[PDB]
Amino acid sequence: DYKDDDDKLHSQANLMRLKSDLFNRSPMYPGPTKDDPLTVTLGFTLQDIVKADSSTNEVDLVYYEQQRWKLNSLMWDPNEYGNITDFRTSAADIWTPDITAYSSTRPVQVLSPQIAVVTHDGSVMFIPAQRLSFMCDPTGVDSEEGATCAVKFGSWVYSGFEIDLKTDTDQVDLSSYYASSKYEILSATQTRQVQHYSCCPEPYIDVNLVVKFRERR
Amino acid sequence: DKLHSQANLMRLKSDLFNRSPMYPGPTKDDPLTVTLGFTLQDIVKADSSTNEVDLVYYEQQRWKLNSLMWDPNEYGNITDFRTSAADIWTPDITAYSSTRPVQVLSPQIAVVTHDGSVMFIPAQRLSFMCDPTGVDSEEGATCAVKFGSWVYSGFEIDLKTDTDQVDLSSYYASSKYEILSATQTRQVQHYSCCPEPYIDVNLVVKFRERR
Amino acid sequence: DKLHSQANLMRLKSDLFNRSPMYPGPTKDDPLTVTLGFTLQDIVKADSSTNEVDLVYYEQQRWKLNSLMWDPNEYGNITDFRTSAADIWTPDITAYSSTRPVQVLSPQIAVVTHDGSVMFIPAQRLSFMCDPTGVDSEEGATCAVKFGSWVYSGFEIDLKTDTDQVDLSSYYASSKYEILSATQTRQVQHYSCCPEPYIDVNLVVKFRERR
Amino acid sequence: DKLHSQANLMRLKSDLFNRSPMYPGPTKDDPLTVTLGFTLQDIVKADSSTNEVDLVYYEQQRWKLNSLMWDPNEYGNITDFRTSAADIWTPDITAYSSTRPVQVLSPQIAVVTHDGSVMFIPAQRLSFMCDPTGVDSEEGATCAVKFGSWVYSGFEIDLKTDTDQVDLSSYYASSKYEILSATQTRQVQHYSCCPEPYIDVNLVVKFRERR
Amino acid sequence: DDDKLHSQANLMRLKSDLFNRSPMYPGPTKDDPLTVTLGFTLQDIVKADSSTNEVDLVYYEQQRWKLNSLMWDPNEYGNITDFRTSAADIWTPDITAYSSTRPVQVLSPQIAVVTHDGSVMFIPAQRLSFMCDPTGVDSEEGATCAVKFGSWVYSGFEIDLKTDTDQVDLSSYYASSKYEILSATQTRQVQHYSCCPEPYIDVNLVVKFRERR
Ligand SMILES: Nc1nc(Cl)cc(N(Cc2cccnc2)Cc2cccnc2)n1
Ligand SMILES: Nc1nc(Cl)cc(N(Cc2cccnc2)Cc2cccnc2)n1
Ligand SMILES: Nc1nc(Cl)cc(N(Cc2cccnc2)Cc2cccnc2)n1
Ligand SMILES: Nc1nc(Cl)cc(N(Cc2cccnc2)Cc2cccnc2)n1
Ligand SMILES: Nc1nc(Cl)cc(N(Cc2cccnc2)Cc2cccnc2)n1
């Protein structure tokens, strides 16, 4: 078991060394630039429509927001570090995209630890669970066809020149939706949109989350 | 080339942010102008039991510092960059009649351009003093809130708007409240006692329930 | 030259904050007088099910430290500056009958003058203990709340007001509550807990539902 | 020998922390088993308008690390100590179906024992998804919530319970809700995407309006 | 005035000698146990929620303890007998309500008073929601509720508690509160658990109150 004990100690030293090599010894990645655009993949896992407030036209959602991207500055050779193929790290240690809901009515509440997973190909996976209030008229929610609301997500400060967005699919993952929610989901889609606004020449990109729902009976 | 671009940005940031480090803010001898513009998104609620109304808007702030200027050719034709608002000086623009601390809805990041201008656009939810009486009539109700520096007079920070028309192109079409008009107007207030003039931007909103 | 004003400002602040260790707070040997003045902006809410009332006001704080003074001639004739409240010592002025933590409505920035004078004016929303019984009568209701240091007795911190009249000139004219009177009065208190006198400023507000 | 008791404790912590390499968290090579146990104190509220229920409980977490071991003999027979949760690694245990961020009710301090085991017990108020339909009947309502690592799969973190019976010995005897049963059960599952198994502890509560 | 400058320099020298010169106190231990004195000053019962059985109290919680590592001879420091310091600069006890339902909200500055004998006084003002059935509050007999306070992580072998009296101080109780106080006591308690070997100490705050008439 001495050998086993030693192998454990070595794997610890190797993880600490990989983290030293990527961070502490190398620059904090400054973010994407026009010559060097970054694509961030987004996908939503809708867990619950908690509340629909017809007195203020706000609706509260809980969901997991999957964010994926990939950087060269986060790559490593797993054979240089004892076959370490990935690691968990505090979101504070790396750059993360400023993905923002554009029509929230209260600051998002974070429901999960701010830790991401980094893989040897340099891909990052960060999945914040969130409670969000957003502008939404729930009239029709007490009808067969229910209510329809939409909310757009995207970078706040990086245009389409610097950050692009994609989805893997336009279907929101509903396999974890709360079976006894006050509201049943009729459909939920997530769709990339590209936009040009009157002012600027930068194209603007978002993912539009559209939810159709009604009072469960 | 990727590493080169990345290197250029990091070199610029280094030159700017610590070589002659944190900017001490404006003074009478080195004053500054902040341009303000509002993009009104939603009147979320009106409480006539307390005379508070809740607004959601984007507040566009713009200013310019010589200490933020650079030549793009010296840094790989980098014309701009994004940085955390805590890495730079920011103006203390404040609503003068809020009743609750402002809630911030957008990342605290700004865009700096090679000519030394900064654009910082905090999205905000604000509760402020407002009597909604009449909001359910044809005339609607009218409320106003002033914005400006808390600690700097007009001798250190001037305020400006590009237009006195609030941007309503993003106003929530299914809001409980419709906008009849919204203006943003520079005001100057002088006082006999103190020789410094005080500057604000008055946001005036006229609004009504739907019909 | 604009450059040189900046260098001068940064150097003054480095001399005052770095080229000397901070002010340790007042002592019995070196007591401190703080002047307080209230600018009452709004009575927002009066909850008769809980006997709490919510106020919005500006609280003016003034004091003076020999350790903050300088000769304007050594520093390009800079006579004053703005600085973050965290850079200097600030008095721990506390509402004695609050029922919730004070909510801060203004930026935490103070103004320091070359004579050692500091002016700090936090805007605050406060819930405090108050029976609003009679608020819906001509006579109105009456409430009070004391402000003073939490940890310094009158031997270390003394309080003053410039007047006994709360500044009502910015009071919100469409508030649900009209102010009948508002006074601020220094009091010398003896508490059974402690052999040292404690000083407060007592804010008394008389108000009623509006006509 | 009390100054010596003190000096020994300081050395131990200095030895373990500000010296020896600290744990970088568990890996597929060096996995960690975390024991969870719940002490249910109160069901505060059941909201049938939103299907949320608020619980107050103590969450017992226990794990063991070689890098936290020591021989009490080298340290004045110190067998355990208390230290801030921020000095050591702690597991990211998370309710999978909360609807608000958890509110912590107890200080963030852990107990570490010479065998390298750590005991951390945060008291929490949790809102989670729960349909309380039937709570006003004899059969009562049943709700469940899963707890597990957010970012570590079963390959890095395994979970266990010491018992499948929730500790009810501190349940508030005058709660609006009576507990009919509460269990805590380890579960394993996979998702068609991934080969790594996922481990949680499922907290199942049956409760009804008290009579 | 040079005298004032000199006192200030002594106070700074003391604080630096006490802290940044002596490695922060690691907390009490089996061999170095500590006694914490607790007293409550009840200011208000703000709210009694009968739909959730939560009651909200506003009170000052007095805490006192003494450490050898904080003592000094005034004669070596310009006869300073005491000073005020941020509560972050020193160890403070982890005194906790055992049946709160919301995190405590702090109403006073986090600053304590240390005196040359090594003793410390820290008095945080707090609003607390805790588990309490206010049934009977609108009657002559009133309602009775209780809430324990004690260390969360130290047992009786490391932290003992004491009260100077078993009567809660009511002299600052708000005279126009919705609720009047029939009685309020604060009593040291020793408990043992089956889970654990060591005995546990708390102070039990019992309050009897009713709707004011
Ligand atoms: N000129 C402009 N106006 C507005 Cl009112 C918002 C906006 N932003 C945020 C922003 C923040 C800092 C610097 N540049 C841009 C981008 C945006 C906002 C909303 C939806 N899509 C993009 N840009
Ligand atoms: N003498 C004085 N009195 C007051 Cl009641 C406020 C004040 N202000 C705040 C203010 C308020 C409204 C509009 N513009 C500015 C300026 C200020 C703030 C902080 C420190 N010094 C001056 N200065
Ligand atoms: N002995 C003692 N007991 C109490 Cl119940 C409060 C107290 N205070 C706070 C106070 C001061 C004036 C008016 N209301 C409250 C002074 C103090 C002393 C030492 C540490 N912190 C506060 N000191
Ligand atoms: N074994 C154990 N289990 C529990 Cl359910 C709680 C606990 N306590 C003590 C305690 C004392 C009085 C009231 N509630 C809790 C807190 C604790 C925290 C961290 C390590 N050890 C004990 N210790
Ligand atoms: N692919 C993926 N997608 C989602 Cl929608 C969540 C997720 N989780 C969270 C989770 C949720 C429920 C039960 N166990 C774990 C794991 C995770 C979180 C952060 C980074 N990488 C993986 N991983």
DSSP codes joined into one string, A5-45: HHHHHHHHHHHHHHHHHHTTTSPPP---BTTB-EEEEEEEE
* Measured torsion, CA atoms of residues C192, C196, C201, C207, in degrees rounded to the nearest 10: 0
CB distance C44 to ligand 2 below 6 Å: no
The distance in angstroms from the start CA to the end CA of chain A is 61
Contact C51 E177 (CB under 8 A): yes
With CA atoms as reference, report the closest residue to A35 among A154, A202, A161.
A161
Tell me the three state secondary structure of residue E169.
strand
- Judged by CB atoms closer than 8 Å, whether chains meet at B174 and A57 is answered as yes
With a CB cutoff of 8 Å and minimum separation 6, the contacts of B192 are none
- The three-state secondary structure class of E64 is strand
Pairwise CA distance, residues C173 & E159, whole Å? 56
Which ligand has the shortest distance to the CA of C59?
Answer: 2
Could you tell me the distance, in angstroms and rounded to a whole number, from the CA of residue A124 to the centre of ligand 5? 13
B85 has a chain C CB within 8 A of its CB: no
**Contact: chain E with chain C (3+ CB pairs below 8 Å):** yes
Q: How far apart are CA B92 and CA C124, in angstroms?
A: 16
Hey, what are D125's tokens? Answer: 């108020």
Residue E54: its chain D contacts at CB < 8 A? 44
Residue C98 near ligand 2, beta carbon < 6 Å = no
DSSP E77-143: TTT--EEEEEGGGS----EEETTBSS--EE-S-SEEEEETTSEEEE--EEEEEEE---TTTTSSS-E
End-to-end CA, chain D: 58
Buried b (16+ CB within 10 A) or exposed e, A181-213: bbbbbeebbbeeeeeeeeeeeeebbbbbbbbbb
Vertex E23, ends E17 and E28: CA angle to 5°? 115
Neighbours of A83 (CB within 10 A): 12
In whole angstroms, give the CA distance from residue E67 to residue E27: 10
Residues in chain A within 8 Å Cβ distance of D52: 50
B99 touches chain C (CB under 8 A): yes
Cβ-defined contact of E23 to D10 (cutoff 8 Å): yes
The CA B106 to ligand 2 mean position distance, Å, reads 28
Q: Do D100 and A47 touch (CB under 8 A)?
A: no
The number of beta carbons lying within 10 Å of the beta carbon of residue E189 is 12
Resolution in A: 2.3
D199 residue type, one letter: I
State the distance from the centre of ligand 1 to the C-alpha of B121, rounded, in angstroms: 7
Residue B147: partners with Cβ closer than 8 Å, 6 or more residues away = B36, B59, B93, B94, B95, B96, B200, B201, B202, B203
Q: Is A197 touching ligand 1 by the criterion CB < 6 Å?
A: no
**Residue A82 one-letter amino acid:** G
Give one DSSP letter per residue of chain D, joined into a string: -HHHHHHHHHHHHHHHTTTSPPP----SSS-EEEEEEEEEEEEEEEETTTTEEEEEEEEEEEEE-GGG---GGGGTT--EEEEEGGGS----EEETTBSS--EE-S-SEEEEETTSEEEE--EEEEEEE---TTTTSSS-EEEEEEEEESS--TTTEEEE-S-SB-B-TT--TT-SEEEEEEEEEEEEE--SS-SS-EEEEEEEEEEEE--
Calculate how far, in angstroms, residue A61's C-alpha sits from the geometric centre of ligand 2. Answer: 41
The ligand placed nearest to the CA atom of residue B146 is 2
D100 and chain A: CB distance < 8 Å anywhere? yes
Residue A44 distance to chain B (closest CA, Å): 20
Per-residue tokens: D129: 């998804």
Burial class of residue C103, CB neighbours in 10 A (0-12, 13-18, 19+): middle
Pick from C122, C49, C121, C131: nearest CA to C97: C131
Tokens representing residue E37 in the block: 């004195």
Q: What is the DSSP letter of C138?
A: T
* Chains in contact with A, where contact requires at least 3 CB pairs less than 8 Å apart: B, D
Number of residues that make up chain D: 211
CB pair distance less than 8 Å for E96 and D107: yes
What is the per-residue DSSP string for chain B? -HHHHHHHHHHHHHHHHTSS-S-----SSS-EEEEEEEEEEEEEEEETTTTEEEEEEEEEEEEEEEEEE--GGGGTT--EEEEEGGGS----EEETTBSSPPEE-S-SEEEEETEEEEEE--EEEEEEE---TTTTSTT-EEEEEEEEESS--TTTEEEE-S-SBPB-TT--TT-SEEEEEEEEEEEEE--SSS-S-EEEEEEEEEEEE--
**Interchain proximity B176–A55, CB inside 8 Å:** yes
Whether B82 and A137 lie within 8 Å, measured CB to CB = no
Q: What 3-state DSSP class applies to E27?
A: coil
Under 8 Å CB pairs connecting chains A and B tally to 77
Chain E residues with CB-CB distance to C130 below 8 A:
176
Ligand 1 binding pocket includes B121 (Cβ within 6 Å) = yes
- A12 in contact with D, Cβ within 8 Å: yes
Write the CATH number for D165.
Answer: 2.70.170.10
**CB spacing of E99 vs D9 below 8 angstroms:** no
How crowded is the C-beta side of D180, counted as CA atoms within 13 Å?
18
Please give the DSSP secondary-structure letter assigned to residue A104.
B
Contact yes or no for B42 and A104 at CB 8 A: no
Cα–Cα distance, D109 to D121 (Å, whole number): 8
Residue with tokens 């055992």: E98
* Residues of A with Cβ-Cβ distance to B110 under 8 angstroms: 157
Q: How far is C30 from chain E (nearest CA, A)?
A: 6
Contacts of E51 in chain D (CB under 8 A): 45, 176
Contact with chain B for residue C40, Cβ under 8 A: no
| Domain boundaries, position C173 | 1-211
Is the minimum CB–CB distance between E22 and chain D shorter than 8 Å? no
Radius of gyration of the CA atoms of chain E, in A: 20
| Number of folded domains that form chain E | 1
Residue with tokens 């009710």: D105
Beta strands B32-47; B157-160: pairing state: parallel
Token pair belonging to D53:
């229920």
Cα–Cα distance for residue pair B184/B205, rounded to 1 Å: 9
Best substitution site from D36, D57, D121 to test ligand 4's pocket, by max atoms within 8 Å of Cβ? D121
d(CA E10, CA E78) in angstroms, rounded, equals 6
Instruction: Give chains near D: 3+ CB pairs under 8 A.
Output: A, E
Nearest-CA residue for ligand 3 atom 6 is: E123
Atom of ligand 1 nearest to the CA of B37: 5
- For residue C144, give both structure tokens: 């009070």
How far is the centre of ligand 5, averaged over its atoms, from the C-alpha of E150 (Å)?
38
